[PDB]
């Protein structure tokens, strides 16, 4: 049925520094339009499973 408890981050502003860690969960903003914490086109949740 699928083990959906193992997630990974697929969007970030900039690549990590070595051994750096980032557990935030802010709505990513692809396009120029601001997101205001809601999903939509060019406003994506940053974690997939």
């Amino acid at each position: 049925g699928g083990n959906y408890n193992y997630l990974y981050r697929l969007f970030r502003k900039s690549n990590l520094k070595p051994f750096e860690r980032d557990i935030s969960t802010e709505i990513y903003q692809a396009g120029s339009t601001p997101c205001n914490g809601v999903e939509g086109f060019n406003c994506y949740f940053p974690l997939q499973s």
Partner: antibody, heavy 120, light 111 residues
Framework: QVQLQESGPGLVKPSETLSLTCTVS????????WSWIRQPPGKGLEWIGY???????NYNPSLKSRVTISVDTSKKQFSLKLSSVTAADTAVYYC??????????????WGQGTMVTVSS | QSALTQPASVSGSPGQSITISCTGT?????????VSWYQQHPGKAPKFMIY???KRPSGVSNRFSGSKSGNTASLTISGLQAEDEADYYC??????????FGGGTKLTVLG
């Protein structure tokens, strides 16, 4: 940069074995996956197996027991041979790459296909 | 060795937005999120659009967006421009270690 290109004939009657190749232009063998994708006229797509490069495989059990894919890494070829065709396999045939490493998946640069009719 | 699901042609006026659906079982699209979309112009070769429910590869407009709810993904176009009249396919990574393609949907920009 990298492009694909089909080959091979098609007009043979019904109940034989056809062949096709997808010689690679820009040069990227030995790193990706490469698969063959059918499409009948006016209908949706389909899928057939792929072949890593070092190892290999085949797929789409519906077409299993008929299809064999092979790879020549030197001159960068995929052979695809289906056997005992049935004139229901009269379709265009693309040879799209695949993608791994950077997950992506789905597919990628395709190859303009090849109308392959099956009849007398 | 079966198939997915998609509606036939849709309609729409320019400048608006539109959303096309792609519904599958919860063993291919529900249980995965490796879905990708493809746009094919009549008599051409399909073109790669976005991998992972959403992620326009560098080279595609930003009028496209992908999303999922559950074993059902969807693609939204914004400001319908009258050159997007094409066919749109979705694909995924069904179990049994295989891929699958949709059924296609003819976009009509309501000329």
């Amino acid at each position: 940069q990298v492009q694909l290109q089909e080959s091979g004939p098609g007009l043979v009657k019904p109940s034989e074995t056809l062949s096709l190749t997808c010689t690679v232009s820009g040069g990227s063998i030995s790193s990706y996956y490469w698969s063959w994708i059918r499409q009948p006229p006016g209908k949706g797509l389909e899928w057939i197996g792929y072949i890593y490069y070092s190892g290999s495989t085949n797929y789409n059990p519906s077409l299993k027991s008929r299809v064999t894919i092979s790879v020549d890494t030197s001159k960068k070829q995929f052979s695809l041979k289906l056997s005992s065709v049935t004139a229901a396999d009269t379709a265009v045939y693309y040879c799209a790459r695949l993608e791994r490493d950077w997950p992506l998946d789905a597919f990628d640069i395709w190859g303009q296909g090849t109308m392959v009719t099956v009849s007398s | 060795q079966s198939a997915l699901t998609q509606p036939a042609s849709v309609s729409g006026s320019p400048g608006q937005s539109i959303t096309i659906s792609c519904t599958g079982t919860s063993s291919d699209v529900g249980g995965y999120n490796y879905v990708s979309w493809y746009q094919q112009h009549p008599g051409k070769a399909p073109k790669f659009m976005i991998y992972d429910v959403s992620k326009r590869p560098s080279g595609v407009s930003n009028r496209f967006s992908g999303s999922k709810s559950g074993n059902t993904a969807s693609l939204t176009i914004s400001g319908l421009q009258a050159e997007d009249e094409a066919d749109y396919y979705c694909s995924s990574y069904t179990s049994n270690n295989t891929f699958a393609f949709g059924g296609g949907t003819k976009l009509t920009v309501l000329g």
